[PDB]
Design a protein around this ligand. Structure first.
Ligand SMILES: CC(C)CCC[C@@H](C)[C@H]1CC[C@H]2[C@@H]3CC=C4C[C@@H](OC(=O)CCC(=O)O)CC[C@]4(C)[C@H]3CC[C@]12C
Ligand SMILES: CC(C)CCC[C@@H](C)[C@H]1CC[C@H]2[C@@H]3CC=C4C[C@@H](OC(=O)CCC(=O)O)CC[C@]4(C)[C@H]3CC[C@]12C
Ligand SMILES: CC(C)CCC[C@@H](C)[C@H]1CC[C@H]2[C@@H]3CC=C4C[C@@H](OC(=O)CCC(=O)O)CC[C@]4(C)[C@H]3CC[C@]12C
Ligand SMILES: *[C@@H]1O[C@H](CO)[C@@H](O)[C@H](O)[C@H]1NC(C)=O
Ligand SMILES: *[C@@H]1O[C@H](CO)[C@@H](O)[C@H](O)[C@H]1NC(C)=O
Ligand SMILES: *[C@@H]1O[C@H](CO)[C@@H](O)[C@H](O)[C@H]1NC(C)=O
Ligand SMILES: [Cl-]
Ligand code: NA
Length: 521
């Protein structure tokens, strides 16, 4: 019970609610993102999560083992999830590397991004406190100016190249930060160091307090009403593009850590005769509320920056993966004693990232050791195996810390553990569960375990709402095609789009291979 609650709280509350949701909501106009957000929430987000928990508790297994007894022909979902989490682990730790770099740069007397008198800055820079001044406003030369935070993030941390075709030279300091984070993760996993006893009280109450104070600071900031209006009121015409629907569905499937093979094991740890339904509903509501209030804070900050800079809200930031690193460092600057609050906030980010990183990597290593235990479970191989896995992941992720490392990271974010592959996996899971096993068969088990019969809503949500949404989104995306573009102006080469589609197809095509191999034998 207690361990279940703590593990599930640490299993999906983290970067997916604070970093990824805000920039996807910002890129799609704001309010128009919310209607598909809630539709997909109440259609599949809670039903599929509850289905995973129930199947884990019922089979007492996870990963491929549960599908090995639910449907042998449909065991490819486990392998697809393994590939998805393996590709996700590579690019999930670059955020932690950036956080470590920011934290190390925080120890100085003055924050580096508070001004742009440094040496890594273009001549087209000035301070936001007087950017709206008449001599430096729409009167003349108001289009090519830039804020110190944008220039810092684009040059000191990234040093962005003209394109992906020009990778430049490798940056060594970010490589060292990545190595340090990987070493910390290896030390934590090898010795089995997890929060226990009374320290978990602070570990759980610190991120919420930091989020609360950040929310208060953002709400008290002038010009946040425009940000709230942008975040809430939707655009009807914008809904005619499949982009909003597909990214809302993937945000639902990502924030809840669905289709990664983790919740099945989490429910497998549970025993029979437990009320999983109430806990699952409460956790889903808590996760959604946390994301909603985090969006409040982000868009209040964005509205403040848009009001102070003099430009429109739709284009005031990167509109890409690095939205948090532009909003939050700008927010922590307004607090008294900025250094202490910056250190606290980046420690909070590190804490929210490290626990999720640990649990995902541990689940991955358990999956691989279960895949071939014959000599893995015997001897001292269970240290060198993690050593090799960490080294390979570090080498693979080293390609995203070069001069042109942002484009590869954006391609990974778009095509690796999101987009069409997650919809594919969720559609297949819902289809098999609802149509081959039978909803009545699962309600029999639910009645046996929890002693009560829920309403006739899970059956519908698994039979008619999820497959229709998945198929509609896929078909409409295929019919109306718009190629991926970093930010909004950069157009990718043909081979880059081919590589991204190959990345997605690598996860997607595991299921047909499994089916054809099972049928051939
Ligand atoms: C970054 C991406 C491209 C990495 C891709 C590799 C991994 C996703 C791992 C995870 C599970 C692994 C598989 C787990 C089990 C097997 C079975 C085994 O192959 C056989 O000999 C087939 C018969 C058997 O099951 O033993 C060893 C390779 C293979 C396909 C592994 C190949 C590498 C896989 C796909
Ligand atoms: C191991 C599995 C999971 C595949 C992983 C592939 C990608 C994560 C990486 C591996 C090697 C990378 C490539 C290696 C070097 C370059 C430099 C550059 O290629 C060029 O066209 C260079 C031309 C020139 O230098 O003259 C653009 C990015 C590219 C192709 C990289 C794109 C991203 C790639 C394909
Ligand atoms: C096609 C392009 C996009 C490159 C894809 C590279 C990899 C992501 C592919 C190449 C070979 C694939 C593997 C080929 C065979 C299998 C075995 C298959 O399982 C079985 O057939 C029985 C169980 C077993 O032994 O694994 C599960 C998918 C898997 C691991 C595949 C996972 C995905 C792999 C590693
Ligand atoms: C900017 O830095 C230079 C030296 O690097 C210094 O001479 C100058 O006074 C600084 N300007 C401001 C406004 O701080
Ligand atoms: C604009 O520049 C002038 C010149 O120094 C200064 O007096 C004024 O305060 C500036 N306006 C703002 C809003 O900072
Ligand atoms: C900004 O204005 C134009 C934009 O095309 C550019 O040519 C000019 O050099 C820039 N001037 C300043 C002062 O930034
Ligand atoms: Cl979210
Ligand atoms: Na977490």
């Amino acid at each position: 019970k207690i361990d279940f609650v703590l593990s599930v709280a640490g299993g999906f509350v983290g970067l997916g609610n604070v970093w990824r949701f805000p920039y996807l909501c910002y890129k799609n106009g704001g309010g128009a993102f919310l209607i598909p957000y809630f539709i997909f929430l109440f259609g599949s987000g809670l039903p599929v999560f509850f289905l995973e928990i129930i199947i884990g508790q019922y089979t007492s297994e996870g990963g491929i083992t549960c599908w090995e007894k639910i449907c042998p022909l449909f065991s490819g979902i486990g392998y697809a999830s393994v590939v998805i989490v393996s590709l996700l682990n590579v690019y999930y730790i670059v955020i932690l590397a950036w956080a470590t770099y920011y934290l190390f740069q925080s120890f100085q007397k003055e924050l580096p991004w508070a001004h742009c008198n440094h040496s890594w800055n273009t001549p087209h820079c000035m301070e936001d406190t007087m950017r709206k001044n008449k001599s430096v406003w729409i009167t003349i030369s108001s289009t090519n100016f830039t804020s110190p935070v944008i220039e810092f993030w684009e040059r000191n941390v990234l040093s962005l190249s003209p394109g992906i075709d020009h990778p430049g030279s490798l940056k060594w300091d970010l490589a060292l930060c990545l190595l340090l984070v990987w070493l910390v993760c290896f030390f934590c996993i090898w010795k089995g160091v997890r929060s226990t006893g009374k320290v978990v009280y602070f570990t759980a109450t610190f991120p919420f307090a930091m989020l609360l104070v950040l929310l208060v600071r953002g709400l008290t900031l002038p010009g946040a009403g425009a940000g709230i209006k942008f975040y809430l009121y939707p655009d009807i015409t914008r809904l005619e593009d499949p982009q909003v629907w597909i990214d809302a569905g993937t945000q639902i499937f990502f924030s809840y850590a669905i289709c990664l093979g983790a919740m099945t094991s989490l429910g497998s740890y549970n025993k029979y005769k437990y009320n999983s339904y109430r806990d699952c509903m409460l956790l889903g509501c808590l996760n959604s509320g946390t994301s909603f209030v985090s969006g409040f804070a982000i868009f209040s900050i964005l509205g403040f920056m848009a009001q102070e800079q003099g430009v429109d809200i739709a284009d005031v930031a990167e509109s890409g993966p690095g939205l948090a690193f532009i909003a939050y460092p700008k927010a922590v600057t307004m607090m008294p004693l900025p250094t202490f609050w910056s250190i606290l906030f980046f420690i909070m980010l590190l804490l929210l990232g490290l626990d999720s990183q640990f649990v995902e990597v541990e689940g991955q290593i358990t999956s691989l050791v279960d895949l071939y235990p014959s000599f893995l479970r015997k001897g001292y191989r269970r240290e060198i195996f993690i050593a090799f896995v960490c080294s390979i992941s570090y080498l693979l992720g080293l390609t995203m810390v070069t001069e042109g490392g942002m484009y590869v990271f954006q391609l990974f974010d778009y095509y690796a553990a999101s987009g069409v592959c997650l919809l594919w996996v969720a559609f297949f899971e819902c289809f098999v569960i609802a149509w081959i096993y039978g909803g009545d068969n699962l309600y029999d088990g639910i009645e046996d375990m929890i002693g009560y019969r829920p309403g006739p809503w899970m059956k519908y949500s698994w039979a008619v709402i999820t497959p229709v949404l998945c198929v509609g989104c896929f078909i409409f995306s295929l019919v109306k095609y718009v190629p991926l573009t970093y930010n909004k102006t950069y157009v990718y080469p043909n081979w880059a789009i081919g590589l991204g589609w190959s990345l997605a197809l690598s996860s997607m095509l595991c299921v047909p291979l499994v089916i054809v191999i099972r049928l051939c034998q």
